[PDB]
């Protein structure tokens, strides 16, 4: 289900930028990040 590391970025939150400045190195987990 969840290992608790599913922190959808404020960047990728609807109404935000949609781009994390950190990219892949972003600590916040993207909804794009699949297994
Ligand atoms: Zn991110």
Q: What is the DSSP string of 3-28?
A: -S-----SSSSTTS-S--TTGGG-SS
1 Cα: distance to centroid of ligand 1 (angstroms): 20
14 Cα: distance to centroid of ligand 1 (angstroms): 13
Q: How far is CA 17 from CA 2, 20, 21, 26, in A?
A: 25, 8, 10, 14
CA–CA dist 20, 4 (Å, integer)? 20
Specify whether the CB–CB gap between 26 and 18 falls below 8 A.
Answer: no
4 Cα: distance to centroid of ligand 1 (angstroms): 15
- State which approach was used to obtain the coordinates: NMR
CA–CA dist 30, 28 (Å, integer)? 7
Output the six-digit token pair for 34.
């699949």
7 Cβ contact partners less than 8 Å away, ≥ 6 residues apart: 27, 28, 29
27 Cα: distance to centroid of ligand 1 (angstroms): 6
Residue span of the structural domain in which 11 resides: 1-35
């Amino acid at each position: 289900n969840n290992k608790y590391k599913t922190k959808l970025c404020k960047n990728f939150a609807r109404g935000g930028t949609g781009f994390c400045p950190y990219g892949l190195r972003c600590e916040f987990v993207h909804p794009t990040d699949k297994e």
